[PDB]
Scaffold this active site. Structure first.
Site, PDB file in Angstrom:
ATOM      1  N   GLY A 149     -21.609  34.786 -34.770  1.00 33.22           N
ATOM      2  CA  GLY A 149     -20.741  34.263 -33.464  1.00 33.22           C
ATOM      3  C   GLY A 149     -19.641  33.363 -33.936  1.00 33.22           C
ATOM      4  N   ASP A 150     -20.198  31.999 -34.477  1.00 33.43           N
ATOM      5  CA  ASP A 150     -19.271  30.898 -34.305  1.00 33.43           C
ATOM      6  C   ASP A 150     -19.101  30.408 -35.761  1.00 33.43           C
ATOM      7  OD1 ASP A 150     -18.335  30.845 -31.698  1.00 33.43           O
ATOM      8  OD2 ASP A 150     -19.918  29.429 -31.060  1.00 33.43           O
TER       9      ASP A 150
HETATM   10 MN   LIG Z   1     -19.289  29.082 -28.957  1.00 29.42          MN
HETATM   11 MN   LIG Z   2     -17.394  35.251 -32.682  1.00 34.45          MN
HETATM   12 MN   LIG Z   3     -16.968  31.921 -30.110  1.00 35.48          MN
END
Ligand SMILES: [Mn+2]
Ligand SMILES: [Mn+2]
Ligand SMILES: [Mn+2]
EC number: 3.1.-.-
Length: 301
Positions: free
Chosen positions: A18-19
DNA sequence: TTGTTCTCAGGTAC
DNA sequence: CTCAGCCAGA
DNA sequence: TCTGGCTGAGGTAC
DNA sequence: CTGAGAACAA
């Protein structure tokens, strides 16, 4: 060579997908042998109000550091040996950034030989190209061409909690509506967002979860789940593993359980709207219009 | 009266 | 998110 | 000549 | 990410 727990790695693979970032760069550098230096970096980015999460990462991984760039912070890991040990263990669990991890490992392993030959060096630089192409690359300047100026259910839930904590959303809404007894309709939504290029990943979500839908708008897609029954069941299974959005998930469960009671009394309906406010307060909420205070204009009806 | 589907979009937090 | 870059130390 | 700590920002993908 | 709201379906 520290050996990491699998449950830690499973959740972290989700959060990284995700991040996080797995990055390979070619720095122009005059003092270097071939006038360029290779840099391999693992990042996890997160809002500074949540840097405790990144500080925990340093402690858990046992190396790397956190920097602060104003409103946003980053865990950073650059040291080659710990980086190799770490990514070797993370990569079996990565789904979106697995190839990048594999290429960064390949690069690290050929570093010694890539520093003794121009031919080898250039080839290793093309691997960097491959990582940049896999990434959401935007402002990349130095490429290898530049250099060519040389002369089981639980396992799924752990990962998913990581992806949810990073790119997912637990949403509670009060929607104005005349037909409703109290002039408002409660709405609950679990969402995972991802650019449409990668909606194959959100399609997998629908399959593994069994319920929900994928929607497209512009160039982004959401997996969404809104039905009360499936949502209660899903979030009951998920919340043990959430770290950033656990409180939101419990509030949503507590709301669902009180829907019967809420739909009969005006004071309990309001009380449940204040639980909605709490969820929004925990979220990075920016464009909220209807709060419980609005509903408190029920002092007419 | 209510639940839910489907799409759009503001303002960052990646 | 994913690049861009400088500097000190060995 | 190499490495790692450290800083700044463009352009979306959340 | 996390809201918004119109409309379909009971
Ligand atoms: Mn996030
Ligand atoms: Mn992402
Ligand atoms: Mn994100």
């Amino acid at each position: 060579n520290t050996k990491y727990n699998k449950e830690f790695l499973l959740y972290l693979a989700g959060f990284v997908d995700g991040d996080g970032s797995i990055i390979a760069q070619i720095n122009p550098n005059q003092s270097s042998k071939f006038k360029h230096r290779l840099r391999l970096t693992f990042y996890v980015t997160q809002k500074t109000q949540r840097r405790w999460f990144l500080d925990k990462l340093v402690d858990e991984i046992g190396v790397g550091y956190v920097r602060d760039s104003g409103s946003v912070s980053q865990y950073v890991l650059s040291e080659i040996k710990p980086l190799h040990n770490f990514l070797t263990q993370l990569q079996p669990f990565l789904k979106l950034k697995q190839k990048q991890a594999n290429l960064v490992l390949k690069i690290i392993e050929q570093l010694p030989s890539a520093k003794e030959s121009p031919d080898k060096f250039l080839e290793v630089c093309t691997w960097v190209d491959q990582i940049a192409a896999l990434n959401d690359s935007k402002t990349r300047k130095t490429t290898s061409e530049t250099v060519r100026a040389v002369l089981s259910n639980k396992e799924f839930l752990l990962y998913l909690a990581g992806f949810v904590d990073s790119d997912g959303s637990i949403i509670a809404q009060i929607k104005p509506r005349q037909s409703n007894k109290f002039k408002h309709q409660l709405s609950l939504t679990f969402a995972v967002t991802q650019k449409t290029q990668r909606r194959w990943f959100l399609d997998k979500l629908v399959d593994e979860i069994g319920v929900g839908y994928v929607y497209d708008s512009g160039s982004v897609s959401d997996y969404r789940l809104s039905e009360i029954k499936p949502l209660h069941n899903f979030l009951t299974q998920l919340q043990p593993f959430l770290k950033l959005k656990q409180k939101q998930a419990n509030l949503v469960l507590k709301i669902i359980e009180q829907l019967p009671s809420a739909k009969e009394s005006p004071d309990k309906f309001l009380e449940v709207c204040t639980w909605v406010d709490q969820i929004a307060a925990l979220n990075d909420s920016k464009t909220r219009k209807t709060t419980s205070e609005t509903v408190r204009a029920v002092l007419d009806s």
